[PDB]
Design a protein around this ligand. Structure first.
Ligand code: CHL
Ligand code: CLA
Ligand code: CLA
Ligand code: CLA
Ligand code: CLA
Ligand code: CLA
Ligand code: CLA
Ligand code: CLA
Ligand SMILES: CCCCCCCCCCCCCCCC(=O)OC[C@H](COP(=O)(O)OC[C@@H](O)CO)OC(=O)CCCCCCCCCCCCCCC
Ligand SMILES: CC1=C[C@H](O)CC(C)(C)[C@H]1/C=C/C(C)=C/C=C/C(C)=C/C=C/C=C(C)/C=C/C=C(C)/C=C/C1=C(C)C[C@H](O)CC1(C)C
Ligand code: SF4
Lengths: 222, 742, 207, 43
């Protein structure tokens, strides 16, 4: 257990009881005294895990269109940098099937169904297995931990069965591969601002000739 | 440690209390027996300290109420921006500022009130404004009504956020007492996070938005053809065509080549000759330097890492050579009493507002502000009044501290004791100096009036007679006017055109500013100001210092902060309470501020404002009559009030008739207050008895028994209506005069 | 007739204590607590049952004529302007006749809400009368000639729920048609064809 | 509750505000329909 910037106050409530516990609270936001609203260890852990899980596929989906286009498997029209796909209108756009805004409502309906349905299990676990839901309510029961739902729907293949310590190791792997993705997202967000070129394209410039480094990219052109 | 600790769900959200008026008070919750109850319900509403003796509950209520005030302020700003976007001639004003009058209020056509929609210009009819919003919006780079709409919508959303935050931080998660008493961390956050970063962000906005937009505006470009604000951001060539230093980016900032940025970071001084305001690059450099100063300041106090000065240690270390450590015990006093903090903060804010009023007329910061005479007069007068009121409130709440929180058995302080032990000497010397100043200032005016009436002008105090020149002020003016070159080699021109150095700036054929000369009349009026201020101090200080006892009432602290008297004995004891000292101080504050604004109005109209011809002949509004006529009382009566009241009294039948109506109505209210001030409540209760007999005769006597106003309420109603009437009378006078003749 | 184990408007939420699935169409939806006091609940039930039938009558007579005109069988004008045309008499003289005739029935219905069962007899001929036995659900040859209103308390509740839901749909449909007519500028049937021609761009954001 | 909100809406300042608003509206509309009257001309 490699403690990192652990303070005297933080060591009291940080005792390696949660996966990926290394003891880094240099501000004390996870202190158990005076809790209310959103600041709460269970909610903070859930939020960290969820932001990381989202950031995983966010970073993965922002690189494939450029590399796969370069290798010669996607038409050049589609293969464009991530920030030129319509999410940022002043930085290029593409003509999709319906609209930049009708797609937003279409997406928001489906995502809001899932989010409003997931929020209930956090409040009272197991409450989604009662009311009729076209026959899928007998599977949307839960496990007892909102962060790790499990079940046939969320685990069709039993990769986390017949062992206990292996589950802890998988949780620790998830924490690392989710913490890496958030920093990757931050990096690819800043790189596009300071360079204006696709992140995958920026890799080759440093890989081939490590001369155009950060100092040469400090003038902050358009 | 410095940790965020709260309590969850302290108060349940319910409508039960809304149906029980007086719920907060154990003596009001019963219900009414007389009409007095009703008045009490409104008088004790926000006096949290009297509701309970628990400090934490008081702090929580204070926090929630402050959130409510912020919500209301945001509503006010949203309304201002929406009315600017929807019912104004701002776009037309953008193309001819000197000839068009700003207007953002229009009225509906009923009962003939549509005459108030006056001809302000630019194909628009409405009411002219003096708040100066148009100049502020022009200085921000705003060129379209859509931007104003967006700002108004944002302000509405912020108001909603503040109200919800008040509800949440009271009824759901209320901070603990230790959270409120972390003064070191609060000071660190409010010095660095609030002021330093706020100034940094505004300086960034000025550098990236305001300057390029105002360049096109002053270059003579149609507003609809100006590039949009975001075009200067995602296209640096457009911004570099005006300031070539944007080609090198931020490299000089980190390589310490800051002199490359001298194009838009200057130290000029003076005024821009086109707009008549301060150079924008000077303002940007100012906000940058101020931001650095506050960011450095906000690292002085210790929170969690064992670095930084402790506030208690500083106070307890200074001590005193007078046989004791004087400043020991102030930290405990200042961390356990809301009233003392309120007193100190009110005094500081009130004085700051007066500073703002003085500085904004002499160094006009907005474009096309100096030649809009009505706006200048309005802003100066407004901030003078606000500052006076805050300063009076400081004395009131210091008295509240002395009565309710002072306790030398638990929290002793040596300096407060030493001050309390020579109060006779302090008060007597202040009394004497007031008498001396009154004689040797007002008696000079009396002597001049007598000499002039007797046909002996050669015996007067005047520039052509016995002279009393203000040599020290003239010397300081001369030092400031010649400062550029020796003591401030890096500045091109002085901070203000009023210092000296003969030079005039004219915009649209109107004078903006020029040197202001000082003579015998200025000497006299300045010593009058000194007199009024020293008297106000005498009254308020007497109120605070003798709050607990005196040679007359040994046990006054047992009677409280606010009580009418202690009986007709001892010769008579009316108005011995501290509240009565505040009541008396409000009158002298009114006197002082009224004289200040009259002096300002006459001096500026006589020696500064006016027109200039092609050859350069300055004609003033009142033609330089201040020097000879302001040295007698008859001169103030004849050449200032009688002469300048003509505009307000001739306004009927035009768009300015509302100001005549308000002039008369305010005289009415002022005279109405005297009925409350001169009489007493026994007479009125006796009269009410007779009226109640008649109502009983016809079976219409109410169960809520009518009663006359209490003695304190009589005094309060009196002073409130006196101040409202006087201030509104002067308001109408000023606005009609300056709008019609300026 | 309490039935806690029934579908609600928001699964996982607790239904209000003043709703227990007795009235037809109950789904435990009353966030603002407008029916917490039992006295106002009956008034709200009657008001909803009246708004529903008015909306159903409006909707059934506002789309079918438009559909027939679009096909070409009938030549009726736009519904959104039929109020401003000219008829055999003055438009103001029709409103007063409508007020008198409808007010007779409205007062006759109002008398039953306050005093149930007190207006069930014909005022002129005291032999004919109505066989209805519940407030808001009358019954007789005038209001139920077929005789579908008399059944066991199994089909009655399902029929009432069917009526309530077919009325709740029409209540939103009528307001939608009004807003579309005011905003789009054409007929309601044309909007359906516009949305079925280009279902990606022909939406509210198009204007 | 509905009982409590109905009780709060019946308090004196709120009821005064509503009553005076309605009366002011009525007088404004009347003066918009029959303006500038100095006498009663109907009979
Ligand atoms: C979504 C962000 C986020 C959140 C909510 C948490 C939350 C947590 N981390 Mg984790 N972390 C997060 C991101 C990261 N952590 C780490 C590295 C660690 C370590 C090494 C450790 C933790 C630990 C903890 C826990 C206790 C510490 C605490 O006070 O938590 C409450 C604290 C917060 C809610 C702070 C939230 C800050 C906010 C996200 C940003 C604030 C502004 C930034 C300073 C600047 C941002 C700029 C933009 C442009 C990126 C807690 C569950 C400790 C533990 O025991 O974990 C099991 C521990 O030892 N975290 C990294 C890698 C650098 C992160 C990267 O994104
Ligand atoms: C003057 C501004 C102000 C201040 C000083 C605070 C202070 C606080 N807020 Mg509040 N808050 C504010 C404005 C403010 N809030 C506003 C405008 C909103 C939007 C409605 C909120 C919404 C909010 C939430 C949702 C939460 C806090 C919480 C907190 C606490 C922790 C803050 C932190 O971790 O840093 C602290 C008592 C947290 C809390 O309750 O901690 C116990 C919390 O969960 N605040
Ligand atoms: C951890 C993932 C990761 C990886 C593999 C890379 C990889 C790369 N980055 Mg990126 N970057 C990252 C995170 C990452 N970055 C983060 C977290 C930030 C801060 C938000 C940045 C900010 C950044 C900038 C501003 C630039 C790059 C650039 C580069 C390239 C040259 C290396 C360099 O100068 O890095 C610079 C990295 C840093 C100064 C900080 C790295 C910190 C982590 C913890 C290590 C290379 C393809 C350069 C490029 O595009 O060249 C063509 C470039 O201009 N990166
Ligand atoms: C850098 C952090 C910061 C900032 C920006 C502020 C800002 C403010 N504080 Mg302070 N405060 C801070 C830290 C901060 N505080 C800390 C750490 C503590 C605990 C020691 C306190 C304790 C405290 C108290 C007890 C009070 C304030 C109050 C105020 C307001 C003073 C009036 C004013 O100038 O309004 C200027 C107005 C604006 C700039 C517009 C509003 C902009 C938003 C709302 C600012 C939100 C700031 C906040 C830190 C956000 C946290 C969000 C998060 C919790 C989710 C102002 C909004 C007073 C007040 O009025 O509270 C309501 C007050 O009574 N603060
Ligand atoms: C930040 C400023 C501030 C704050 C938070 C407070 C807070 C407080 N003050 Mg202090 N005070 C302040 C500024 C402040 N004061 C100033 C500037 C002054 C100098 C004038 C005073 C003078 C003062 C006195 C003399 C007293 C207080 C008292 C109080 C307490 C009760 C107030 C109350 O219930 O009012 C309830 C509010 C009303 C009944 C309504 C007042 C309306 C005013 C008088 C007229 C408004 C007219 C308006 C501008 C025009 C409308 C015209 C139109 C209707 C036609 C409370 C702790 C009282 C106390 O007992 O403290 C312990 C007390 O006696 N204050
Ligand atoms: C115009 C009205 C007026 C006048 C002249 C005064 C005068 C005075 N007030 Mg009063 N006051 C007034 C209105 C007025 N008040 C009102 C309306 C209120 C109610 C709000 C008060 C409330 C009030 C308070 C609460 C206090 C005063 C104080 C004072 C004194 C200030 C000290 C001073 O200047 O001494 C110098 C004297 C004068 C300026 C008077 C004029 C003298 C002339 C110019 C010269 C006379 C020459 C010669 C002697 C003539 C002899 C002739 C022979 C035949 C007899 C002074 C006696 C304060 C005080 O006592 O301070 C020590 C004080 O505390 N006043
Ligand atoms: C009083 C009315 C009412 C309201 C306001 C709600 C509100 C809600 N219900 Mg509830 N519900 C109601 C009645 C109501 N319900 C009734 C009467 C029942 C009994 C049958 C239910 C049964 C029910 C269930 C079973 C569920 C909800 C859920 C929800 C939530 C959905 C949140 C979301 O993001 O939706 C997103 C949707 C929208 C924002 C509306 C989008 C509408 C689009 C534009 C329609 C397009 C139709 C399209 C043309 C059809 C063909 C498409 C094809 C061509 C591709 C929300 C809190 C869900 C939930 O989260 O539960 C926890 C859920 O699972 N409700
Ligand atoms: C159930 C009623 C209903 C139906 C079937 C439709 C259908 C339609 N509307 Mg209309 N609309 C409705 C209600 C309805 N509307 C309501 C209540 C409003 C007022 C808020 C509007 C306001 C409106 C506007 C302003 C416009 C349309 C338009 C349209 C068309 C394109 C879709 C769109 O943009 O929707 C936009 C949707 C809304 C603005 C809000 C809809 C809210 C209701 C409650 C949704 C109900 C969904 C329903 C439960 C799904 C199942 C239905 C069932 C029969 C299968 C489409 C033919 C557009 C058009 O003319 O295209 C040619 C158009 O410009 N509608
Ligand atoms: C402005 C300066 C006024 C003169 C201060 C002179 C000065 O410092 O005096 C000395 C003393 C304060 O100075 P000390 O060095 O003695 O400091 C004692 C400390 O415990 C508190 O300051 O002041 C008085 O005793 C009364 C001052 C009020 C004015 C009395 C007249
Ligand atoms: C896919 C796609 C597609 C298309 O094309 C486009 C789009 C849409 C754009 C995309 C998407 C994307 C996404 C979704 C993303 C996401 C992201 C995230 C979530 C991030 C985070 C992220 C996150 C992050 C950074 C975070 C961070 C954090 C931090 C630092 C913290 C720190 C700390 C801690 C620990 C604690 C202590 O006491 C304090 C401190 C020291 C302060
Ligand atoms: S006159 Fe009034 S204030 Fe003076 S002692 Fe008598 S009761 Fe008290």
């Amino acid at each position: 257990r490699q403690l990192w910037f652990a303070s005297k106050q933080s060591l009291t409530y940080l005792d390696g009881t949660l996966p990926g516990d290394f003891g880094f609270d240099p501000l004390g936001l996870s202190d158990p005294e005076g809790t209310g609203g959103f600041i709460e260890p269970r909610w903070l852990a859930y939020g960290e895990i969820f932001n990381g899980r989202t950031a995983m596929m966010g970073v993965v989906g922002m690189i494939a269109p450029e590399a796969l286009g370069k290798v010669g498997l996607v038409p050049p029209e589609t293969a464009i940098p991530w920030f030129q796909a319509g999410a940022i209108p002043p930085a290029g756009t593409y003509q999709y099937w319906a609209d930049p805004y009708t797609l937003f409502v279409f997406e928001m309906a489906l995502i809001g169904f899932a989010e409003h349905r997931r929020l209930q299990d956090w409040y009272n676990p197991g409450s989604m297995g009662k009311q009729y839901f076209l026959g899928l309510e007998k599977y949307l029961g839960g496990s007892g931990d909102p962060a790790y739902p499990g079940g046939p729907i969320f685990n069709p293949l039993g990769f986390g069965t017949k062992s206990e310590k292996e589950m802890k190791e998988l949780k620790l792997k998830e924490i690392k591969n989710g913490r890496l993705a958030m920093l990757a997202f931050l990096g690819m967000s800043l790189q596009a601002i300071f360079t204006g070129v696709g992140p995958f394209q920026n890799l080759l410039d440093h890989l081939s000739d490590p001369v155009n480094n950060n100092i040469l990219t400090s003038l902050k052109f358009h | 440690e410095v940790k965020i600790v709260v309590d969850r769900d302290p108060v349940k959200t319910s409508f039960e209390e809304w149906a029980r008026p007086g719920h907060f008070s154990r003596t009001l919750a019963k219900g009414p027996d007389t009409t007095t109850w009703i008045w009490n319900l409104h008088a004790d509403a926000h006096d949290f300290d009297s509701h309970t003796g628990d400090l934490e509950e008081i702090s929580r209520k204070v926090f929630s109420a402050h959130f409510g005030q912020l919500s209301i302020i945001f509503l006010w700003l949203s309304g201002m921006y929406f009315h600017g976007a929807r019912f104004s001639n701002y776009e037309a004003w953008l193309s001819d500022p000197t000839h068009i009058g700003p207007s953002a209020q229009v009225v509906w056509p009923i009962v003939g009130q549509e005459i108030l929609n006056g001809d302000v210009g630019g194909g628009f009819r409405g009411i002219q404004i003096t708040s100066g919003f148009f100049q502020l919006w022009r200085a921000s780079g705003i060129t379209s009504e859509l931007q104003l709409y967006c700002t108004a919508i944002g302000a509405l959303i912020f108001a909603a956020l503040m109200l919800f935050a008040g509800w949440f931080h009271y009824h759901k998660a209320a901070p603990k007492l230790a959270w409120f008493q972390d003064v070191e961390s609060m000071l660190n956050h409010h010095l660095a996070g609030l002021l330093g970063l706020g100034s940094l962000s505004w300086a960034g906005h000025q550098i990236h938005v305001s300057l390029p937009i105002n360049q096109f505006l002053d270059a003579g470009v149609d507003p609809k053809e100006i590039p949009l604000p975001h075009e200067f951001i995602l296209n640096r060539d457009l911004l570099a065509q005006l300031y070539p230093s944007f080609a090198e980016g931020a490299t000089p900032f980190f390589t310490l080549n800051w002199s490359k940025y001298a194009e838009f970071l200057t130290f000029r001084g003076g005024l821009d000759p086109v707009t008549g305001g301060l150079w924008l690059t000077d303002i940007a450099h100012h906000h940058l330097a101020i931001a650095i100063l506050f960011l450095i300041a906000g690292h002085m106090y210790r929170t969690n890492w064992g670095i930084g000065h402790g506030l208690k240690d500083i106070l307890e270390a200074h001590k005193g050579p007078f046989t004791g450590q004087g400043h020991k015990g102030l930290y405990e006093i200042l961390t356990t009493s809301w009233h003392a903090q309120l007193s100190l903060n009110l005094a500081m804010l009130g004085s700051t507002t007066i500073v703002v009023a003085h500085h904004m007329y002499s160094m006009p910061p907005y474009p096309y502000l100096a030649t809009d005479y009505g706006t200048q007069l309005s802003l100066f007068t407004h901030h003078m009044w606000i500052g006076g009121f805050l300063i009076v409130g400081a004395a009131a709440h210091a008295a509240i501290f002395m009565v309710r929180d002072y306790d030398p058995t638990t929290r002793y302080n040596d300096l407060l004791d030493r001050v309390l032990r020579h109060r006779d000497a302090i008060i007597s010397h202040l009394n004497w100096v007031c008498i001396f100043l009154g004689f040797h200032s007002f008696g000079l005016y009396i002597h001049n009036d007598t000499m002039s009436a007797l046909g002996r002008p050669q015996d007067m105090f005047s520039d052509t007679a016995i002279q009393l020149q203000p040599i020290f002020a003239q010397w300081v003016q001369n030092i400031h006017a010649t400062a550029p070159g020796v003591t401030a080699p890096g500045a091109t021109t002085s901070t203000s055109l009023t210092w000296g150095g003969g030079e005039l700036v004219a915009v649209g054929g109107k004078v903006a500013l020029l040197p202001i000369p000082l003579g015998t009349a200025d000497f006299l009026v300045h010593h009058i100001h000194a007199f009024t201020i020293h008297v106000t101090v005498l009254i308020l200080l007497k109120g605070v210092l003798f709050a607990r006892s005196s040679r007359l009432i040994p046990d006054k602290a047992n009677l409280g902060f606010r009580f009418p008297c202690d009986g007709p004995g001892r010769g008579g004891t009316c108005q011995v309470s501290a509240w009565d000292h505040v009541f008396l101080g409000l009158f002298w504050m009114y006197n002082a501020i009224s004289v200040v604004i009259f002096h300002f109005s006459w001096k500026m109209q006589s020696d500064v404002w006016g027109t200039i011809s092609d050859q350069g002949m300055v004609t003033h509004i009142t033609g330089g009559n201040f020097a000879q006529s302001s040295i007698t009382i008859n001169g103030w009566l004849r050449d200032f009030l009688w002469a300048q009241a003509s505009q307000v009294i001739q306004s009927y039948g035009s768009s300015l008739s509302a100001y005549g109506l308000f002039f008369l109505g305010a005289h009415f209210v002022w005279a109405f207050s005297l009925m409350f001030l001169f009489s007493g409540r026994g007479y009125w209760q006796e009269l009410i008895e007779s009226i109640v007999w008649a109502h009983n005769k016809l079976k219409v006597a109410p169960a809520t028994q009518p009663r006359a106003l209490s003695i304190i309420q009589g005094r309060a109603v009196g002073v409130t209506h006196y101040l409202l009437g006087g201030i509104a009378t002067t308001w109408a006078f000023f606005l009609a005069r300056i709008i019609a003749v300026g | 007739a309490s039935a806690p184990d029934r579908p609600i408007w928001f699964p996982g939420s607790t239904p209000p204590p003043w709703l227990d699935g007795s009235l037809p169409g109950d789904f435990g939806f009353d966030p603002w607590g407008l029916g917490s006091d039992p006295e106002s609940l009956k008034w709200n039930v009657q008001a909803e049952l009246v708004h529903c039938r008015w909306a159903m009558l409006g909707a059934a007579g506002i789309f079918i004529p438009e559909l027939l005109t679009k096909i070409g069988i009938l030549n009726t004008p736009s519904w959104y302007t039929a109020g401003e045309q000219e008829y055999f008499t003055d438009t103001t003289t029709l409103f007063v006749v409508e007020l008198i005739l409808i007010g007779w029935a409205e007062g006759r219905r109002w008398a039953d809400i306050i005093k149930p069962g007190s207006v069930n007899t014909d005022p002129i001929f005291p032999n004919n009368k109505l066989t209805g036995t519940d407030v808001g659900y009358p019954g007789g040859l005038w209001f139920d000639p077929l005789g579908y209103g008399n059944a066991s308390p199994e089909k009655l509740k399902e029929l009432r729920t069917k009526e309530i839901k077919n009325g709740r749909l029409a209540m939103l449909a009528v307001m939608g048609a009004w807003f579309q007519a005011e905003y789009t500028g054409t007929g309601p049937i044309d909007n359906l064809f516009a949305h079925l021609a280009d279902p990606g761009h022909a939406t509210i954001f198009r204007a | 509750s509905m009982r409590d909100i109905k009780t709060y809406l019946s308090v004196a300042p709120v009821l005064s505000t509503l009553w005076f608003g309605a009366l002011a509206g009525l007088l404004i509309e009347i003066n918009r329909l029959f303006p500038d009257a100095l006498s009663f001309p109907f009979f």
